[PDB]
């Protein structure tokens, strides 16, 4: 699990990977870790997978309730204040590590949320197990107010540093580019890990398995 974010001169680029493990066995080769919140705000999840899913849908339900009652575009500080006040009430029992990003009227805003309820506003963050490898690329190669393709190249480099560290992914690096007007969302942005071909004959026969009892039931 490796998620990261950055603030360039116009908006926010988010990045993630595509592996869910159980124990030390790869359970999923393609898991979507960037979650929808609003048409300007997205969120990356880390930690307990079911705790991040149920939390990121509740707040996305309330902001849709709030903005439709207000009649205007939501604010990122509203989503920050709902999350940090929810997670503090559960005393860290809900294990959710979140990266919150979006573009408001005031501009782009990037946050990082810890499962006890401590939040930080930063120009760039990394969360997850492979966060230490991805912070190496940021702290070496960040400069303020980068351009579009310069920022997308940086995040795709920083996520790839965590993938070639352990507990990386069956790599499909994801990107979500949020700007003032344009919104992008790229699931197969880079596929570096290809499964090799199968070179064996595995001839199966229609009748190589013994059957004790058959049963047919038609339908309509």
């Amino acid at each position: 699990t490796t998620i990261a974010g950055v603030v360039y001169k116009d908006g926010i680029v988010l990045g993630a990977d595509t592996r869910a493990t159980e124990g030390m066995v790869v359970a999923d080769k393609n898991c979507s870790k960037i979650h929808f919140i609003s048409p300007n705000i997205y969120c990356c999840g880390a930690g307990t997978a079911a705790d991040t899913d149920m939390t990121t849908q509740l707040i996305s339900s309330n902001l849709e309730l709030h903005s439709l009652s207000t009649g205007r575009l939501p604010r990122v500080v509203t989503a920050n204040r709902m999350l940090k006040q929810m997670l503090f009430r559960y005393q860290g029992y809900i294990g959710a590590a979140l990266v919150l990003g979006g573009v408001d009227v005031t501009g782009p805003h990037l946050y990082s949320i810890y499962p006890h309820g401590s939040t930080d506003k930063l120009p760039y963050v990394t969360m997850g197990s492979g966060s230490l490898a991805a912070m190496a690329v940021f702290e070496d190669k960040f400069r303020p107010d980068m351009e579009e393709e310069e920022a997308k190249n940086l995040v795709s480099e920083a996520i790839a540093a965590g993938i070639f560290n352990d507990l990386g992914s069956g790599s499909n690096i994801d990107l979500c580019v949020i700007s003032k007007n344009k919104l992008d969302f790229l699931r197969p942005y880079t596929v570096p890990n290809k499964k090799g071909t199968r070179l064996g004959r595995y001839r199966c026969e229609k009748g190589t398995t013994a059957v004790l009892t058959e049963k047919i039931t038609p339908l309509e």
């Binding site: 709030h66 604010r75 509203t78 006040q85």
Partner: protein, 239 residues
């Protein structure tokens, strides 16, 4: 009449209900009249005071009520119901800032106030608060706004506003006034906010019988005018 005696809040066969529309004439026992005007980037509240006694003070009479740093209001109707109405307004403005992390719009605050008044109509067993509230505030990418909240639970936003005893006379002036194309350059606003009231009541004060709240997109703080600068504008429209 058909005559249901209108003792509680239920319907009449005509289709209406009388207890809520008895609260609209509950404002009139204040013996008072208030005017709000929105012309340009500034918005002006103006309201007279009535000090009947010399033993009675002056500072503790004012109906201008500061809700937040950037939102003020004025209250009409009876006094005791008006101040409790303000306490819910001050309270729920602070829950917005706590829950949502930014300053409440002036439009959203009247929705919260009118919904509290709606429950007292829908559900019985509480008297429905015979007072009216007029707000002002600055909203970014929207300009300044003026809103009125009714005891029935009705609200709307509009440019020139009257309340109190003399609505129909003062609003008849402002239709005749706001039909041309003015630019309302903050002394155009204050002068008409006087002279809308300065066709109506035939009074002549020396400048200590009104109150004027103001807000402006150069200093969006709510601001109650000084007796000296009230006297300035009272001879500035006025040659």
């Amino acid at each position: 009449s058909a005559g249901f005696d209108r003792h509680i809040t239920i319907f009449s066969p005509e289709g209406r209900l009388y207890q809520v529309e008895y609260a609209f004439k509950a404002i009139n026992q204040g013996g008072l009249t208030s005017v709000a005007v929105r012309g340009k980037d500034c918005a002006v509240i103006v309201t007279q005071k009535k000090v009947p006694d010399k033993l009675l003070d002056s500072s503790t009479v004012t109906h201008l009520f500061k809700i937040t740093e950037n939102i003020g209001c004025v209250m009409t109707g009876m006094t005791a119901d008006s101040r409790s109405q303000v306490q819910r307004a001050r309270y729920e403005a602070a829950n917005w800032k706590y829950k949502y992390g930014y300053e409440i719009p002036v439009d959203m605050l009247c929705k919260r106030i009118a919904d509290i008044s709606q429950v007292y109509t829908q559900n019985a067993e509480m008297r429905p608060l015979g007072c009216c509230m007029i707000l002002i505030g600055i909203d970014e990418e929207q300009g300044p706004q003026v809103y009125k909240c009714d005891p029935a639970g009705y609200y709307c936003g509009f440019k020139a506003t009257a309340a109190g005893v003399k609505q129909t006379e003062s609003t008849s002036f402002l239709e005749k006034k706001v039909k041309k194309k003015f630019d309302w350059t903050f002394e155009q606003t204050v002068e008409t906010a006087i002279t809308c009231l300065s066709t109506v009541l035939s009074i002549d004060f020396k400048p200590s019988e009104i109150e004027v709240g103001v807000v402006t997109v150069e200093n969006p703080k709510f601001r109650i005018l000084t007796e000296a600068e009230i006297d300035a504008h009272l001879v500035a429209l006025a040659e």
